[PDB]
Amino acid sequence: APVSGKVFIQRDYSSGTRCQFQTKFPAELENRIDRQQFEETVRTLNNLYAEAEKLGGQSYLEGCLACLTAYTIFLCMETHYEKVLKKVSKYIQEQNEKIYAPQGLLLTDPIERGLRVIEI
Amino acid sequence: VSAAAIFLVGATTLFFAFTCPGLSLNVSPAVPIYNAIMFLFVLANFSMATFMDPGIFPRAEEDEDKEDDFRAPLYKTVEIKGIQVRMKWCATCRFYRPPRCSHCSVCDNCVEEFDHHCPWVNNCIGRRNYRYFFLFLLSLTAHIMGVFGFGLLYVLYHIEELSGVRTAVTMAVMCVAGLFFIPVAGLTGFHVVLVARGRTTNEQVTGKFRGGVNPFTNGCCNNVSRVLCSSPAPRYLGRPKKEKTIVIR
Ligand SMILES: [Zn+2]
Ligand SMILES: [Zn+2]
């Protein structure tokens, strides 16, 4: 299994410190992955992380429940961000097995990289 | 090595052993709500702040990011909210330190969003434990205020004599609260200011930001929301390792 190189995607920072990556298509990936599907997958992954962050009423309710129960609800039930990570992990596995593998690419979970750079 | 604040618990247990059993026959009936729940909250928050990963980045190994650095001054600038911030090419941690985080020197690690390091907390405060530490401080100052403002009943209703027996138990806790309230109140008010502003600790230390500063100031209520009722982050280190799929052509 020969390896050619690695490309890192910096995080999008115009929005702020939220966990969205720079969607701009890197020039190294020409003819390996098209711009359209890379745009699609990065947009969906960023949407998933944004959904993991949303300050909706459910986040307020889970915070209140954790405060009342002395946070033991974390031990019994995984946090919202963790289940979103599970879902996005499933997403990246199916994307890798359906698009990148025939194109000779593979994607790793950014959580292994600390949500800093995604490695292809 | 380093030790925690055992004496703070020792002051509280004075109330637990004998301070107000059986006084509520003609006065204030509902006893525990004043101190017991506050002590449990303080203990839980303090423990979860002490033993918990605060956001240790996973020690980025070599061959990381870009190796085209020939003689760069080891800082790349990003303009968040249109305002530039200067981050640093960390040497041992081996990555760019995304904005609003730094090293910890004595802690020997380089972390995510950094607040402060202290031996009393035994660690450095990131953002995973920032909510826990903030509620710990708020609950602790609430506990001290409640003691010094209402638990003094056992003397305040007590007539001149107050002669020994169990009064000496309350004798010391009064001066303990008096000596300990001012520093903890000042420090928790400090952190309250640091929460009201989108700007914390080392950012106070930097006497250079004058003008279009604090790009991540957000909107006050939004800051309290994200620090109190946001979904907790997961640990960036020690997650189980996956496995490869195929040779991939
Ligand atoms: Zn570092
Ligand atoms: Zn530290």
Numbering used by the authors:
A (entry chain B): 6 to 125
B (entry chain A): 17 to 265
From the article:
The small molecule caspase independent lethal 56 (CIL56) induces a unique form of nonapoptotic cancer cell death that is promoted by a complex formed between zDHHC palmitoyltransferase 5 (ZDHHC5) and an accessory protein, golgin A7 (GOLGA7, also known as GCP16). ZDHHC5 is one of 23 mammalian enzymes that catalyze the S-acylation (“palmitoylation”) of hundreds of proteins in the cell, regulating protein localization, stability, and function. The family of 23 mammalian ZDHHC enzymes is defined by an Asp-His-His-Cys (DHHC) active site motif.
